[PDB]
């Protein structure tokens, strides 16, 4: 769930991505 959003969200800076951990 989380782990396959993290990939897409760590490729836009993951915490720094504008948006918090899919987690």
């Known amino acids: 769930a989380?782990?396959?959003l993290l990939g897409?969200?760590?490729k836009?800076?993951?915490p720094s991505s504008?948006?918090?951990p899919p987690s």
Do not use: H, I, T
Request: aromatic share 8%; charged share 25%.
């Open 18 to 20: 504008g948006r918090p």
């Open 12 to 14: 836009d800076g993951g």
């Open 2 to 4: 989380l782990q396959e």
């Open 8 to 10: 897409q969200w760590l």
